[PDB]
């Protein structure tokens, strides 16, 4: 199941009211959307407000890792923010999904 | 760092104890220095080993008991068997699952 990774466009927030657009990478482990990571162009993000029907959770982000994607004009850097306390299995699923897609 | 999640596929052959044989894909990383097989995917249960070429050579790579998963095909769903190599760490197992999820129609 960790393999069935899905992407949802979502806003990120950081100190001082700064914001980003980006994608949450997430998995429906048994009928509840579990965010694993957030990817964006922008540094300094701290959290994402993540929607469940039961209500919104603010998901805290680790310090980001920088990574490379391919573009029409060459490599560009994006930031990958794992959710706090994500385990190694789920981190690996994020990296594998990214490696296969970007 | 996406390096440990980076993955390539190579067509290869598996074996189980009692003469069992299979064809399938090895998922491996050759991140920088050597080829490191992470997993083997095939259509058959009961595989125990994969015959991994390296050098020129053939290496026998031991497998964990498989997880079954299902893919869409032109003729409908097909059961596949995912065998991690023995003692693959959780980060790398996760990388295998993420890569399969990204590339296969599950």
SS3 of residue A99 by DSSP? helix
Top CATH class, A5-102: mainly beta
CB A59 within 8 A of CB A72: no
Q: Do A4 and B93 touch (CB under 8 A)?
A: no
Within 10 A of A6 (CB to CB), how many other CB atoms are there? 14
DSSP secondary structure string, B3-54?
A: GGG--EEEEEEEE-TTS-EEEEEEEEE--SSS-EEEEEEES-S---EEEEE-
Report yes or no: A63 at the B interface, CB cutoff 8 Å. no
Phi-psi domain of B33 (left: phi exceeds 0; alpha: psi -120 through 50; beta: other): left
A4 part of contact set with chain B, CB < 8 Å: yes
DSSP label at residue A12:
E
Identify the experimental approach.
X-ray
Question: Could you tell me which of A29, A12, A30 has the C-alpha nearest to residue A21?
Answer: A12
Q: Which of A99, A12, A5, A70 is nearest to B27 (CA)?
A: A99
Task: Identify from A75, A93, A94 which residue to disrupt to test chain B contact, counting B C-beta atoms within 10 A and taking the largest count.
Answer: A93
Phi-psi region of A88 (alpha: psi -120 to 50; beta: other; left: phi over 0): alpha
Which residues on chain A are in Cβ contact (under 8 Å) with B99?
96-97, 99-100
Q: In this structure, what token pair is assigned to residue A78?
A: 């994006």
Residue B72 contacts A, CB cutoff 8 Å: no
Q: Judge whether A100 is closer than 8 Å to chain B, CB to CB.
A: yes
> Could you tell me which residues come within 8 angstroms of residue A95 by beta carbon, excluding any fewer than 6 positions away?
B2, B4, B5, B91, B94, B95, B98
Q: Which fold has domain B7-106?
A: Thrombin, subunit H (2.40.10)
A82/A90 Cα distance (integer angstroms): 10
Q: Which residues pair with A64 in a beta bridge?
A: none
């Amino acid at each position: 199941k960790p393999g069935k990774m899905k992407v949802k466009a979502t806003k990120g927030e950081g100190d001082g009211g700064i914001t980003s657009e980006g994608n949450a990478l997430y998995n429906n482990e048994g009928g509840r959307a579990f965010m694993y990571a957030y990817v964006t162009t922008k540094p300094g993000m701290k959290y994402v407000k993540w929607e469940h029907d039961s209500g919104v959770v603010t998901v805290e982000l680790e310090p980001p890792a920088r990574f490379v994607i391919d573009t029409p004009t060459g490599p560009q850097i994006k930031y990958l923010y794992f959710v706090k306390n994500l385990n190694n299995l789920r981190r690996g699923a994020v990296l594998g999904y990214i490696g296969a897609t970007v």
